[PDB]
Design a protein around this ligand. Structure first.
Ligand SMILES: [Mg+2]
Ligand SMILES: [Zn+2]
Lengths: 99, 489, 497, 119, 302, 447
DNA sequence: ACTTGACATCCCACCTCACGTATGCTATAATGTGTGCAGTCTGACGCGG
RNA sequence: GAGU
């Protein structure tokens, strides 16, 4: 089984699981650790954004690949936004501070 | 929005007003037949944003031509659906309720600020006994428990000067009135004359809390919640299974109960209901609120219609199945494939067998770009049509992309960094991935049906890091000891 | 002694959060005297209501808002609902014949005029006038007004007292906080004179350097007193009799409210028991119990001791009803009007019987037969009958998945198709360039291509320069030439889609 | 060395210290630089040992610590502290989908650090 | 996670002294193995082949190590990750070789996670493996006899023994080791002998090849008396602190002194002893010292 | 009916039968789990109950259990073992009266077993008298050693009572370590029937029994002579012996060919005997899938050579001959099921027709007028089986789209591609098709 | 190249209709109750008392 | 039910 693009998850907007959904494999914290052991930051970032929850980023990088660019240009993963909103639901203020 | 830092503090009730766009008055979600959002309901379009892109409720106004258009009849703003992930709503709580987290979780900042044990606070909150806020009379000062008729034996004789109340609202009041500045200074002066050991330790702790509190600028009255923020609808979405059936988040059921009980409290207030039932309702309000935040912390939790405990906001963040570990520090990824490993004696050290059909799928977009640039396909639509038939040409383009590309092989568990290695993939017939014998030791892999994942670093940078830093041929020595991992077996 | 038993049990309460226990404890202390005890407090209801009505007959403004609000709806031709249905509904100790209304209002006006003449002669209430005032009040006791209207009349007096006390509070705020004056001396002087200015300068007559300071803003001080005095004038009530009415009315109201408190708390046990029958896994125990209490409220207020029948019997229905209606409307995520709910109820009662007759199941046709409803309608109801199943439902029998781990967003046009639409727009502008400048802008504007807005034929004609019909021909010319495979090499592929 | 991350202060600086406070070894050396060069009253310190879990929970990266364990507790403490996470560590950037400050990401990350000095 | 190489060298002189680990039975891990690829702090001196000196701040490569092997220096102050001056992270120098690469570590590489993965890895492996290959259970516990391998002098450090009737040099010290001197005076071989172990050759005398110099029974640590006379019983009552096991025949028994678990509530503080009295009665004292010999028999001392 | 169907459907103990082979089914039926209501879960189970008790002797196989967190919890019933009166485990044992070994069997529970002194089956027995050795090999009160003849009360029926059904099939278990033994029983459970059944060269005698009880084979219940033989019908004329003077003496066995198992595996019966053959009561008329003439035919037997190859057999990897495919051995029949659903949205009722907008007529060609795939047609992954149309609703013409719709025409007919696709990379033949029309709407042509 | 007018087809908005929805009212007497499973582990740091 |  293999997946490039297909159906994504409802809440997190991550790729689904299983051959049944045309799902992608989870690249887990274990795998993360491997990348970290190497200095491999851009691969990791791929896995975190263009490959998963960043909509604008994955679509843009798709088009870049066809065009022969291979530039990343990352966005914000949806999971992190999920996180923010759930914290504010708990009445806990989390703001991302400007420079 | 290119950022430096993240700060966390108590949410002010009026700050919660700020984030919230509209008040959710009704427990209803949507109409049963027409599944459109209900007015001031949980999935309200007027509050949380429009269901469908650039199209209002009643449906007179659509198209990009209308952006920021505010439909006069329905009160629907015309914009992107995406807003339903980001607008918050809110609830006006009739009885200021205490936040469970700051009570039942240790140490419990309320308890430690007031140097008051849990039980006292409980009996107060649960309306079992009254407590003294402000005593003009020397007989009793701050934090005294009074029963039913002790309060009467107190009220009858004194009153006038004598201030006491019951419940979370009383505690809110005691929170505002306690002197932030003075007490800090008092404690250090206490320290100056005499410090028996353990007393000075606890007094020290308290000093730390207090100072930290007033430096951060967090106000104690914020412990008591007046406004209850409500999570964006997309995060608690309501969806039909294809068989007509529905699935809804557990958040929705807890929230619904919250609203139901709050509305009943409005009715009971307007009716001037007797104390006993008013008190009972405040218990119930507190329950629902605290269940919504963290269910079961408070003792016996609300269950599923099943039997299964309802999943609270806390579970969503915290659990191992919570957001952190399942969706944030790790996730499912595209451009990866997975299948059984088979021996590749003929492969070189930096190589691996990559099954035809797997690689076809993986490298899809690379295919399209070159298809269009070489003019083999008129446009991208035709390139897709040309991939889905599968002629000789397709394979050749795949060949050219795969040439000098490195791909990553992964085996779970990721014991060490060499649980993922980079290889030059070589296409083969069949559905089985071929692995080089030498590197079996590092993956601790053996040929008895183990599967591996194969990820594609897509960018030039990813490719670079894979071939340079992660390449099999680059990493022979264990980072653990200096000795070789990739070796005879 | 009852409270003492409460407190000993409370000393043992081992943090049992179960509100069941808590409520059970409190109610457990309160005993219930029956038979006549109930009727006792019912009598207190009646006398409270009549109290306020006596005031309405006796009070100047009260009769005014009566006739004044009769004209609003009746004068306009001939009206019988809205305001009239809110009012009236009278009991002489229901379709209201015009004949009776004409008669019942007639004797009022005559009484009004005669009751005015005596007021003026000599005193406010000199002896005879006091006796006739009492008889006037006894005439009004006869009528009962419907609750909805009664509120607003009660409201005019309630807020008037607020105005009185608040005006004094604001006056004494500035006076006592900025100026300074002992309230004991206040008592005598204000109660004696009120209306005349003697008390103003007599107070300063006690001397002492502070009293003389007052001239710099002299105008403001006594003119502000004028606001209060003007309330006196417009109210038209003398302070000797003003107090009497307001406080006495206050008394009536308090009697009634506290009396009901006793009554309601005595009947707690009844509500709870009746609720626990329908506790039957619909919502929660406690929610039900709360709804039942609302039913008792209703029972209390519409309960009549005159009926001569047991309270339990009557209240039972109100509490029972509250519970039924509440489950129907709350309960499910999909809120449902009751007509649909009642139909569902029929369904399932019949289901049991039919399964037992057939030895198996009920097909829609056979079911539809017995109900005499259209099969389509039955099937509709069957589908609508499905309750919210949880999105968080552990789909994994092994705690693998919270249903959500299936759900995909079909809203998302796929990155495949998004690439497609991009290529399409780019291709469109390039073929636009092939056209003649203004021809290009014609089609560009006509379809909003590369503009936030679409202009139709007439609006394009306006912006172009008169020509409307020529634009039809231009559209056709573009069509004709763009059909040519030359410019349309790029567009050709998209014909398949 | 990670387990040695924290120390205990005897004696006030110009800062938020005082008797028995359990502050990071890094913040102590930062105070050193700035105070020794300018003067002000000195602060006496002693090194402390924390094992694993506690050490992790003690670090000034509350999203790091929140990702570890005791999510509930750590959040509340940081919320009351009004704590400000400056985001120098790894998992922080991980979660935000940023450039790891290790290795390949070193370049970009030091650039942001110099941009802090320039206003 | 936060530990990364930020600096090349902060300039610390501090460091940790690493030895060749001579834990008991042998030199299980030598200095070379422990130190390879590390930066050194300071120079160590030893009277050696020609008065050894070794320049500091230097990373010790394989070949450096070979040279120092011929000198046979014992203790080396090596600049450590811990003794690093760098804030939030460490120095290239303080860390040393990145084992996987062969060279000095690259500045910026996350050494923290490096260490963690390496150390978690084997734990996870060494569980799984002897759990699905070792289908039974046993351990090398025949700690019976010591055996000197090469011909040298016997020389003891840290003990105080007391000579008996049968004639064994019985060790009563917890701090005992039994080493081996070669031709011109060095500590070659090392053994660890526990309390109660019979010896053969004491201090000074030469042992020929593969001769039995120490001896003790494994499954049983005896407590051995330093002085003579009659055994006097103190606080060993039956049920409180000891359990009667007696047979018929001529009427022999073997007392078992039970620990805390089997003791009733009254016999909690009772410390059971065997007091050393003489033929006359009175506390005979251990030679030269003041102790009236009262040997505290521990929990379950049969 | 709710509570019953609760138990039957939702409970832990009610599971999909494993029908990979008859062994799988039979073993599953008699497996015994420590979970369920009144029982333990995974965390709730420590070493206590998981570990191997001496009592398990002749009652549970000590050697048959899922590896991983399920281990210790679920265990197969040993061969000869059954439940006693009170649902306690018991084993049949032979009496031994005064030295001589009697012929009587008694079933004993664990409690009963503790009491008596039992010789192993392995102990050597003098022909219908006593024991051959003076000092003999037995166990009493749960503990093994040497006893003399007179003291010995009972004895094992056979060795195979120690082990479960799965474990009993393995031939030389005696020389195999328990770890691999465990894995062996497990793998046997996952074996799939091929096209061509082969009897195992090395069996145990149990291979007849196993098949017999599996009951997927068809067995003669009277005996007599076979009157008619069909690959679908086996009809037998009984001897007047077993013949009822009431009814007629003809017994009819309709066989089932190629039905789908839960695992997607093959369930086909082949007739064994021939027309006019005289057979006895309890003869094997027709074989189930992995069954030869009476015997378990789990798999197939090949000439293996133990040797290292040029790293094609590296680490337990397998080198194999093209001859295997030549003979068609180890070829599986998989009967896969797919369902096409025509639902009703309020968007409009979906319909099944041959009507499929913008499809290649390649895909249209194989469909009947109803939109149903032809019987027996061979297709591939992606190919359309059953046609379906669904209510669409467009009108979102962003500017550029309107332009082209005008020019070329191609007038858009509202309909999604609901039509029934075949799964990815999968290709086989349609063996059969089924149609269920709801009562409301009228009959389909194909239906 | 463009306009004009005629005649013929299509798109937007407001009105009467009909079903759908919201809330009230019922009188023999009915008045202290529900309810379960959680657990067994297991070393652990911690406060409370 | 797979393997580490
Ligand atoms: Mg394997
Ligand atoms: Zn609208």
């Amino acid at each position: 089984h293999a997946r490039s693009t297909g159906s994504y998850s409802l809440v997190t907007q991550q790729p689904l699981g299983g051959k049944a959904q045309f799902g992608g494999q989870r690249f887990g914290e274990m795998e993360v650790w491997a990348l970290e052991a190497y200095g491999a930051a851009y691969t990791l970032q791929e896995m975190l954004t263009v490959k998963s929850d960043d909509v604008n980023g994955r679509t843009k990088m798709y088009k870049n690949i066809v065009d022969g660019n291979h530039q990343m240009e990352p966005g914000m993963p949806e999971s992190f936004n999920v996180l923010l909103k759930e914290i504010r639901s708990l009445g806990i203020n989390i703001e991302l501070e400007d420079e | 929005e290119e950022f430096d830092a993240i700060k966390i503090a108590l949410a002010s009730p009026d700050m919660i007003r700020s984030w919230s766009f509209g008040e959710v008055k009704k427990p209803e979600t949507i109409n049963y037949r027409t599944f459109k959002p209900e007015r001031d309901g949980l999935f309200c379009a007027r509050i949380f944003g429009p269901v469908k892109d650039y199209e209002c409720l009643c449906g007179k106004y659509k198209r990009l031509k209308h952006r920021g258009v505010i439909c006069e009849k329905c009160g629907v703003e015309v914009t992107q659906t995406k807003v339903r992930r980001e607008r918050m709503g809110h609830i006006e709580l009739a009885s200021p309720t205490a936040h469970i987290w700051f009570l039942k979780s240790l140490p419990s900042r309320i308890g430690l600020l007031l140097d008051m044990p849990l039980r006292d606070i409980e009996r107060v909150l649960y309306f079992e006994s009254y407590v003294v806020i402000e005593g003009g009379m020397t007989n009793l000062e701050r934090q005294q428990i009074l029963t039913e008729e002790q309060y009467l034996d107190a009220l009858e004789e004194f009153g006038d000067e004598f201030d006491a109340k019951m419940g979370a609202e009383a505690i809110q009041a005691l929170l505002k009135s306690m002197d932030l500045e003075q007490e800090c200074e008092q404690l250090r002066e206490e320290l100056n004359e005499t410090n028996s050991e353990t007393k000075r330790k606890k007094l020290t702790k308290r000093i730390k809390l207090l100072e930290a509190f007033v430096q951060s600028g967090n106000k104690p009255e914020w412990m008591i919640l007046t406004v209850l923020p409500v999570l964006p609808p997309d995060l608690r979405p309501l969806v039909p299974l294809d068989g007509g059936r529905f699935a809804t988040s557990d958040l929705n059921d807890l929230y619904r109960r919250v609203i139901n009980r709050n509305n009943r409290l409005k009715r009971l207030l307007d009716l001037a209901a007797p104390d006993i039932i008013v008190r009972n309702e405040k218990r119930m309000l507190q329950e629902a609120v605290d269940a919504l935040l963290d269910n079961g912390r408070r003792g016996r939790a609300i269950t599923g219609s099943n039997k299964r405990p309802l999943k609270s906001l806390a579970d969503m963040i915290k659990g191992k199945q919570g957001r952190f570990r399942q969706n944030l520090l790790g996730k499912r990824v595209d451009y990866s494939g997975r299948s059984v490993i088979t021996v590749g004696p003929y492969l070189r050290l930096h190589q691996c067998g990559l099954p035809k059909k797997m690689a076809l799928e993986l490298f899809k977009p690379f295919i399209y770009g070159k298809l269009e640039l070489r003019g083999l396909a008129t446009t991208i639509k035709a390139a897709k049509k040309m991939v889905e038939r599968e002629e000789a040409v397709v394979w050749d383009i795949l060949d050219e992309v795969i040439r000098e590309h490195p791909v990553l092989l992964n085996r779970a568990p990721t014991l060490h960094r060499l649980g993922i290695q980079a290889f030059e993939p070589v296409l083969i017939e069949g559905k089985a991935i071929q692995l080089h014998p030498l590197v079996c030791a590092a993956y601790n892999a053996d040929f008895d049906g183990d599967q591996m994942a194969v990820h594609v670093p897509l960018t030039l940078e990813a490719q670079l890091e894979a071939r340079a830093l992660m390449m099999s041929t680059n990493n022979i020595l264990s980072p653990a000891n200096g000795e070789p991992i990739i070796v005879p077996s | 002694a009852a409270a003492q038993v409460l407190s000993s049990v409370e000393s043992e309460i081992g943090r049992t959060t179960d509100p069941v226990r808590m409520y059970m404890r409190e109610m457990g202390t309160v005993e219930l005297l029956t038979r006549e005890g109930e009727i006792d407090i019912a009598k207190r209801i009646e006398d409270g209501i009549n109290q306020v009505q006596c005031s309405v007959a006796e009070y100047p403004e009260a009769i005014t808002y009566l006739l004044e609000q009769y004209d609003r709806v009746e004068a306009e031709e001939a009206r019988l609902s809205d305001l009239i249905t809110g009012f009236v509904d009278p009991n002489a100790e229901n379709s209201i014949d015009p004949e009776l209304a004409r008669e019942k209002f007639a004797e009022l006006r005559a009484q009004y005029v005669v009751t005015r003449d005596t007021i003026k002669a000599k005193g406010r209430s000199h002896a005879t006038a006091q006796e006739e005032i009492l008889k006037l009040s006894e005439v009004f006791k006869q009528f009962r007004l419907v609750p909805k209207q009664f509120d607003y009349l009660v409201n005019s007096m309630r807020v008037m007292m607020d105005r009185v006390r608040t005006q004094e509070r604001l006056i004494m705020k500035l006076c006592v906080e900025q100026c300074k004056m002992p309230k004991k001396n206040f008592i005598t002087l204000f109660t004696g004179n009120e209306t005349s200015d003697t008390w103003f300068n007599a107070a300063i007559a006690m001397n002492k350097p502070w009293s003389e300071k007052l001239h710099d803003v002299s105008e403001e001080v006594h003119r502000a007193l004028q606001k209060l005095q003007q309330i006196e004038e417009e109210t038209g009530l003398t302070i000797e009799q003003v107090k009497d009415i307001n406080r006495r009315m206050s008394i009536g109201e308090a009697k009634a409210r506290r009396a009901k408190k006793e009554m309601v708390e005595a009947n707690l046990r009844l509500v709870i028991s009746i609720a626990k029958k329908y506790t039957n896994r619909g919502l929660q125990f406690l929610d039900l119990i709360q709804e039942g209490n609302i039913g008792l409220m209703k029972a209390v207020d519409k309960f009549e001791y005159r009926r001569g029948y047991k309270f339990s019997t009557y209240a039972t229905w109100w509490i029972r009803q509250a519970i039924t209606r509440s489950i129907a409307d709350q309960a499910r995520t999909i809120r449902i009007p009751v007509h649909m709910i009642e139909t569902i109820n029929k369904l399932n009662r019949i289901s049991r019987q039919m399964l037992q007759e057939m030895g198996r199941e009920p097909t829609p046709e056979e079911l539809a037969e017995r109900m005499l409803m259209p099969e389509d309608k039955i099937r509709k109801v069957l589908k609508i009958a499905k309750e919210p199943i949880s999105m968080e439902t552990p789909i994994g029998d092994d705690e693998d998945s919270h249903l959500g781990d299936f759900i995909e967003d079909t809203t998302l046009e796929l990155p495949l198709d998004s690439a497609t639409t991009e290529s399409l727009r780019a291709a469109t502008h390039d073929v636009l360039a092939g056209l003649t400048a203004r021809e290009a802008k014609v089609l560009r504007m006509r379809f909003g291509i590369d503009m936030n807005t679409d202009y139709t034929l007439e609006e394009v004609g306006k912006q172009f320069d008169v020509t409307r019909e020529r634009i039809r021909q231009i559209e056709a010319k573009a069509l004709r030439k763009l059909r040519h495979p030359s410019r349309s090499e790029v567009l050709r592929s998209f014909l398949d889609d | 060395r990670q387990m040695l991350r924290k120390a205990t202060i005897v004696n006030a600086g110009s800062s938020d210290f005082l008797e028995g406070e359990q502050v990071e070894y890094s913040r102590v050396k930062i105070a050193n630089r700035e105070l020794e060069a300018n003067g002000k009253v000195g602060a006496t310190y002693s090194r402390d040992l924390l094992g694993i879990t506690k050490a992790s929970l003690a670090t000034e990266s509350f999203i790091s610590a929140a990702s570890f364990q005791e999510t509930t507790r750590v959040l509340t403490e940081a919320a009351v502290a009004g704590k400000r996470d400056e985001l120098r560590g790894l998992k922080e950037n991980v979660i935000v989908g940023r450039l790891i400050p290790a290795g390949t990401g070193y370049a970009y990350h030091q650039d942001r650090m110099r941009r802090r000095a320039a206003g | 996670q936060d530990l990364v190489v930020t600096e090349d060298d902060c300039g610390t002189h501090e460091g940790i002294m690493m030895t060749p680990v001579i834990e008991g039975g042998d030199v299980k891990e030598p200095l070379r193995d422990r130190v390879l690829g590390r930066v050194t702090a300071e120079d160590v001196l030893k009277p050696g082949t020609a008065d050894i000196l070794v320049p500091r701040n230097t990373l010790l490569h394989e070949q450096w190590c070979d040279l120092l092997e011929e000198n046979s220096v014992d203790a080396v102050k090596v600049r450590s990750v811990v003794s690093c001056d760098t804030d939030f992270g460490v120095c290239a120098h303080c860390y040393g070789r990145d084992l996987a690469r062969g060279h000095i570590i690259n500045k910026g590489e996350a050494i923290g996670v490096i260490a963690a993965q390496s150390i978690g890895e084997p734990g996870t492996q060494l569980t799984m493996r002897t759990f699905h290959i070792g289908g039974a259970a046993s351990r090398a516990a025949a700690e019976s006899s010591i055996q000197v391998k090469n011909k040298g002098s016997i020389k003891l450090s840290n003990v105080k023994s007391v000579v008996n009737s049968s004639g064994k040099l019985v060790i009563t010290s917890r701090n005992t080791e039994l080493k081996l001197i070669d031709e011109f005076g060095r500590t070659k071989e090392s053994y660890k002998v526990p309390y109660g172990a019979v010896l053969a050759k004491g201090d000074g005398e030469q042992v020929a090849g593969g001769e039995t110099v120490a001896n003790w029974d494994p499954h049983t640590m005896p407590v051995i008396t330093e002085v003579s006379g009659f055994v006097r019983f103190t606080d060993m009552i039956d049920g409180q602190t000891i359990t009667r096991q007696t047979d018929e025949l001529t009427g022999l028994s073997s007392l078992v002194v039970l620990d805390s678990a089997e003791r009733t509530a009254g016999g909690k503080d009772l410390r059971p002893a065997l007091k050393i009295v003489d033929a006359q009665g009175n506390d005979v004292l251990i030679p030269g010292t003041d102790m009236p010999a009262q040997y505290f028999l521990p929990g379950k001392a049969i | 009916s709710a509570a019953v169907k609760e138990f039957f459907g939702s409970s832990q103990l009610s599971q999909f039968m494993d029908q990979n082979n008859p062994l799988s089914e039979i073993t599953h039926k008699r497996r015994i789990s420590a979970l369920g209501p009144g029982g333990l879960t995974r965390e709730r189970a420590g070493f206590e109950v998981r570990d191997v008790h001496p009592t398990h002797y002749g009652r549970v196989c000590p050697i048959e259990t899922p590896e991983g967190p399920n281990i210790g919890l679920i265990n197969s019933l040993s061969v000869y073992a059954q439940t006693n009166e009170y649902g306690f485990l018991e084993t049949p044992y032979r009496k031994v009266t005064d030295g001589v070994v009697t012929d009587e069997i008694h079933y004993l529970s664990a409690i009963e077993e503790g009491n008596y002194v039992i010789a192993q089956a392995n102990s050597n027995l003098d022909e219908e008298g006593h024991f051959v050795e003076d000092l003999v090999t037995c166990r009493s009160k749960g503990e093994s050693s040497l006893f003399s003849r007179d003291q010995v009360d009972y004895m094992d029926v056979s060795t195979q009572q120690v082990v479960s059904v799965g474990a009993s099939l393995i031939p030389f278990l005696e020389h195999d370590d328990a770890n691999r033994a465990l894995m062996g029983a497990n793998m046997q459970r996952q074996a799939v029937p091929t096209l061509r059944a082969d009897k195992p060269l090395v069996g145990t005698g149990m291979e007849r029994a196993v098949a017999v009880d599996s009951g997927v084979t068809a067995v003669a219940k009277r005996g007599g002579v076979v009157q008619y033989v069909d690959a679908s019908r086996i009809v037998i004329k009984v001897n007047e012996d077993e013949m009822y003077p009431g009814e007629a003496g003809i017994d009819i066995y309709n066989l089932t060919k190629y039905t789908r198992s839960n695992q997607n595996t093959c369930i086909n019966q082949m007739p064994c005997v021939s027309l006019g053959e005289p057979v006895e009561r309890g003869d094997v008329l027709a074989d189930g899938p992995s069954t030869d003439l009476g015997e378990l035919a789990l798999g197939q037997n090949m000439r293996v050579a133990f040797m290292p190859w040029n790293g094609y057999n590296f680490e337990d990897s397998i080198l194999v001959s093209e001859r295997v495919v030549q003979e068609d051995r180890f070829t599986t029949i998989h009967i896969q099921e797919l369902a096409c659903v025509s639902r009703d949205t309020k968007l409009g009722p979906e319909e099944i027709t041959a009507d499929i907008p913008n499809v290649g007529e390649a895909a249209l060609s194989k469909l009947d007028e109803s939109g149903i795939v032809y019987i027996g047609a061979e297709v591939t992954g992606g190919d359309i089986l059953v046609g379906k149309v669904t209510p669409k609703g467009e009108t979102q013409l962003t500017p550029e789209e309107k332009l082209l719709r005008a020019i070329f025409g191609e007038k858009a007919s509202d309909v999604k591609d609901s039509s029934l696709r075949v799964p990815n990379g999968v290709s086989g033949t349609v063996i059969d098709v089924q149609v269920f029309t709801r009562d409301g709407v009228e009959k389909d042509k194909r239906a």
